[PDB]
Amino acid sequence: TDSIVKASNWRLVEVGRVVLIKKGQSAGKLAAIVEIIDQKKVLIDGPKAGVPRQAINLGQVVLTPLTFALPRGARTATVSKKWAAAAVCEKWAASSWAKKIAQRERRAALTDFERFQVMVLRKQKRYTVKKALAKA
Amino acid sequence: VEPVVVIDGKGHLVGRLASVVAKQLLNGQKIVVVRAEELNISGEFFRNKLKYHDFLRKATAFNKTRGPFHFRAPSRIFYKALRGMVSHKTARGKAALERLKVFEGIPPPYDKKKRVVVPQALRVLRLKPGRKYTTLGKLSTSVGWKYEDVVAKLEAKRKVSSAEYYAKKRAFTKKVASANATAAESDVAKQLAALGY
Amino acid sequence: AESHRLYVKGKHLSYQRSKRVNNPNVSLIKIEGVATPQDAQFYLGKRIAYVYRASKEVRGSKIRVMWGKVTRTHGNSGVVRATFRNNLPAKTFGASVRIFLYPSNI
Amino acid sequence: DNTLLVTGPFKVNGVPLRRVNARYVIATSTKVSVEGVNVEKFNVEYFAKEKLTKKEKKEANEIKTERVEDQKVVDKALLAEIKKTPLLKQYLSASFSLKNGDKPHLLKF
Amino acid sequence: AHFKEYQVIGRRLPTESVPEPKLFRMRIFASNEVIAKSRYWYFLQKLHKVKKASGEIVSINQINEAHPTKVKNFGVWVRYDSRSGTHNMYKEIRDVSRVAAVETLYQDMAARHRARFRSIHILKVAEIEKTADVKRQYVKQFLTKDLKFPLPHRVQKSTKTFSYKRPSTFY
RNA sequence: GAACUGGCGAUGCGGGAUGAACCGAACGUAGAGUUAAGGUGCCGGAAUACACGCUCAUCAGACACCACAAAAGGUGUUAGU
RNA sequence: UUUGCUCCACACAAUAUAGAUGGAUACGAAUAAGGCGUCCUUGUGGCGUCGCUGAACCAUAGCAGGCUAGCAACGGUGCACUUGGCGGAAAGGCCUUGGGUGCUUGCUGGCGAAUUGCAAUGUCAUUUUGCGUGGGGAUAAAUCAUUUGUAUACGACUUAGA
């Protein structure tokens, strides 16, 4: 046989790692880590989403599974160019994380008539699903 | 938000859980705490045994019967830590404390109900990895609790029955998820997806 | 339907107090759902009713109401200050209470 | 007198022609057009209670015909506008209530 | 507080025996202009025979960072008073600007030596322009090629007092 | 036992758990707002806030007056010369 | 002890409420790891996916929720039964078979609502007791007094007596 370990990988922080700003003035946009200050804080830049180039504590951002190629210390023109080339914005939008965010804000933006409409549609869908729950 | 909140005491810190729960009772929420033998106290087992022996020394000199009572069960240790944080000598404190019952294990009124956790009192979220902690059941059976093994046997039986429940629940939810996926991509499904559901 | 509630539930926590002196003229209300003063600013000026029961029928009912209103926010966690026509009887610490949506401004 | 003239319509949910206070309603975003309704007939003197004397005490225990055909005139003009967009008749017939987990400071009406 | 850097230029009051004094200049990290001018007069009373009544301040100007988005390594030379004596220290900090570097320096001295703002004297702060002149291991650790590391044990703070599932610390 | 000033005695109120003198502030009867000194896990009104570090004690430590600890040591650990 | 006691159904009174107002919605273990799905040689296995909070899920339209007509399905749900299990930690609950009956907003119609007058909790919950009905069910002991002495200041204790 062969040796087996559980690898247990998680989300390294390095240059080119895409992060989501959790709280602050941006608070929900994407950025790319440009360089690492120390153990607790990094220099990021989010030039497509309008995040200014700044040093930020690592507790204020969430690391995403997205990575792309950057040299360390890259200026914002190169950051925007490589971001557009790797095309990570729709790669983020294709994830179920961003779909969950969009679902949450859509449900927040519903009105009372739309809530009545989703109640009627959910009753119709529940009727056909519980009808399907009688043959298997 | 709930009539009764059932808290699984496993992996929780005693003081932080007690300060959450005492404020919940004083605000008027009914709390029942199950699995009190699996609470955690930060620090070495020898430190907390020495702390309990220092507490156990204290008694009224002329009559030990009217002194401080040193209760030995883990639930009563938790009750002591919580009665310290409720002003129990007033009518408001008594009315708060009668909204609480704490148990070792999960009794049959509550084994079929839903258990919650308190994330600001959980040991894995509060302590630094590397700090040493204790188990309240081990400390309590070291200082004189007699029923550590019967609770373990009852908990083993309850876990067997609960796994038998969960297998059927998982099979049913896989059937329901399959039917929901096959009944998706219809017109009502796309309208609900446009409207956010 | 099965629900007819047109109010928001809240809890009567305590009076306005220092460490050792309380003031029964101002009550403290925990509205459920709100956890910040910026969300609690929506509920300012709303009417509050404490609804309780009695054994003796007075004017066709055995249910008596005490009316008040939200005046300001309290603290950092969405507790509000409330004033009533007659102050709340202090045995209702932890009792449920109703925050209506009128006077409205939406 | 700073009051809002409202109607159900009476065929939909049984609410007649009435006046309400503006501080006791919620203005939802749902909008229908009421052009084609002649509401200038109604005023503050149109709703009179005919105040009761102190002698007339109800120990134990009707409607204006002018009011009932005024209601029948206006509601048939409203429901023609209601039939354009779907589910408005059902929406107006159903009642509003707060469910568990509804936060009115976050809800948009 | 959150520090700012000022240049403060002052001189002695002009007399008939000597007009145009020599216009001394110093760089001060301070919270505002008042504290900056107070620290300026403090260090000039330590250096030359002058005081505030006998002198004047001709200019104060805020010097903000030239490249606030370049990551630098700074070497800082510091005097501090301990409980028994006065010592000189050299600490080096990897950070993005001078004011933030001296803010973390003040926090570091207050944390590790219990030295207060009244006890710390900032001799100088200078950017180390070349690597391998870095002499401390805790900052030389972050200068390696393709630096990457994970963040184990994620703790997410909750808004509700009750959670309905056992949380995970995967990151 | 003296010197200068401020107090208590003669003085309640908020804080220091508690206390004549300490801190804050001196007082007609009420309403609203803002604060001082002190605090914001629970008792207990108010952030289980944010940020950088340090410490694990088989007698930890936790706030002026104030309710104690020294000389001498320790490849415990951290930062320096 | 002049028809008393208990249980069941509703009928009316009284009595209060530490505080209903859609639903307490059930794996276990780990956290420097897991959950779910799938496949196999069934393992400390391979592959895929998810988390980043319950901001969820279920439920939710009708006189505080009426009276009726039809369509489509053979589903969903309530009530009283009924068959079979399981549950002793404080089981007093969970699951299931069969038929009955009511509703169905899955879809389309017809009639009603006003006047509580511009708001007034605008009254709908459960806790205990009594008294009436009418329908079952069963026909005791203890204490004082007398006695005992394994007991005893007195009470108390231990005995006996149709």
The 8-class DSSP code of residue C104 comes to: P
Domain map of chain B by residue range?
A: 1-147, 148-197
Cα nearest neighbour of C29 on chain B = B27
> D100: which residues sit within 8 A by CB, 6+ positions away?
B1
CB contact under 8 A, D87 and A117: yes
C-alpha distances (whole Å) from C40 to each of B28, C45, D105 are: 21, 11, 8
B158 vs chain A: nearest CA distance in angstroms? 31
Q: What is the CATH number of the domain that holds A80?
A: 2.30.30.30
Phi, psi of D52 (to 5 degrees): -100, 145
Nucleotides in chain F with any atom closer than 7 Å to protein CB: 13-16, 31-33, 41-54, 56-58, 60, 78-81
Q: How far is the CA of B117 from the C1' of G127 (A)?
A: 33
Tell me if chain B has a CB within 8 Å of the CB of A103: yes
> Which single residue has its CA nearest the C1' atom of nucleotide G37?
B174
Tell me if chain B has a CB within 8 Å of the CB of A106: yes
In 3D space, the residue among A118, A96, A121 whose CA is nearest the CA of residue A109 turns out to be A118
**Which chain D residues contact residue C9 at CB under 8 A?**
none
- The CATH architecture annotation of domain B1-147 reads Alpha-Beta Complex (3.90)
List the chains bordering chain A where 3 or more Cβ pairs fall under 8 Å. B, D, E
What is the stated resolution of the deposited model, in angstroms? 2.6
CB contact under 8 A, A63 and E151: yes
Consecutive H or E run containing E144:
none
The residue of B2, B87, B92 whose CB has the most chain C CBs within 10 angstroms, and thus the best one to mutate to test that interface, is B92
Domain that holds residue A56: 12-94
The helix, strand and coil proportions of chain E, stated in percent and rounded to the nearest 5, come to 20, 30, 45
Q: Is C86 exposed, middle or buried (0-12, 13-18, 19+ CB in 10 A)?
A: exposed
Q: Could you give the CA distance from residue D87 to residue A115 in angstroms, rounded to a whole number?
A: 12
In contact, C82 and D4? CB cutoff 8 Å = no
| CB < 7 A to strand G: residues 99-118, chain B | 99, 103-115
> B74: which residues sit within 8 A by CB, 6+ positions away?
B36, B37, B39, B104, B136, B137, B139, B140, B145
CB contact under 8 A, D87 and A111: no
DSSP output for C4-57:
---EEEEEEEEEEE-SS-EEEEEEEEEETT--SHHHHGGGTT-EEEEEEE-SS-
DSSP output for E37-99:
HHHHHHHHHHHSS--TTTEEEEEEEE---S-TTS-EEEEEEEEEE-SS-EEEEEEEEEES-HH
Rg, C-alpha atoms of chain B: 22
> B55: which residues sit within 8 A by CB, 6+ positions away?
B68, B70
Q: How far is the CA of E5 from the C1' of G46 (A)?
A: 61
Only one residue has tokens 């007339």, namely D56
If you count them, how many residues does chain A have? 136
Torsion sign, CA atoms B135, B137, B140, B141:
negative
CB contact under 8 A, A114 and B175: no
Tell me if chain A has a CB within 8 Å of the CB of B182: yes
In contact, E154 and E170? CB cutoff 8 Å = yes
Q: Which CATH class is domain B148-197?
A: mainly alpha
Written as one letter, the residue type at B71 is F
> C59: which residues sit within 8 A by CB, 6+ positions away?
none
Rg, C-alpha atoms of chain D: 17
Q: Could you give the CA distance from residue B157 to residue B167 in angstroms, rounded to a whole number?
A: 16
CB contact under 8 A, A111 and D30: yes
Q: Is the CB of E94 under 7 A from strand F?
A: no
Domains of chain E: 2-68 (3.10.20.10), 69-145 (3.10.20.10)
DSSP output for chain D:
--EEEE---HHHH---SEEEEGGG----S-----TT--GGG--TTTS------SS---S-----HHHHHHHHHHHHHHHHHHTTSTTHHHHHHSPP---TT--TTT---
In 3D space, the residue among E126, E6, E3, E127 whose CA is nearest the CA of residue E63 turns out to be E6
Q: Is the CB of D93 under 7 A from strand G?
A: yes
Question: Burial code of C16-40, b = ≥16 C-beta within 10 A, e = fewer?
Answer: beeeeeeeeebbbbbbebbeebebb
> Which single residue has its CA nearest the C1' atom of nucleotide G89?
B107
List the determination method: cryo-EM
| Lookup: tokens for B41 | 């106290």
Cα nearest neighbour of A107 on chain D = D107
The 8-class DSSP code of residue E126 comes to: E
> A2: which residues sit within 8 A by CB, 6+ positions away?
none
In 3D space, the residue among E45, E42, E48 whose CA is nearest the CA of residue E121 turns out to be E42
Consecutive H or E run containing C58:
none
Written as one letter, the residue type at A4 is I
CB half-sphere exposure, E145, CA atoms < 13 A? 0
The fold for domain C1-106 equals Thrombin, subunit H (2.40.10)
**Which chain B residues contact residue C94 at CB under 8 A?**
26-28, 96
CB contact under 8 A, E96 and A63: no
Tell me if chain B has a CB within 8 Å of the CB of A116: no
Q: How far is the CA of B16 from the C1' of G89 (A)?
A: 28
> In C, what residues contact D, Cβ < 8 A?
1, 3-8, 33-34, 39, 42-43, 101-106
> Which single residue has its CA nearest the C1' atom of nucleotide G61?
D94
Q: Three-state SS for C97?
A: strand
Q: Three-state SS for A63?
A: strand
Consecutive H or E run containing B33:
strand B30-34
| Lookup: tokens for E150 | 């994970």
Q: Could you give the CA distance from residue D4 to residue D2 in angstroms, rounded to a whole number?
A: 7
**Which chain B residues contact residue E151 at CB under 8 A?**
none
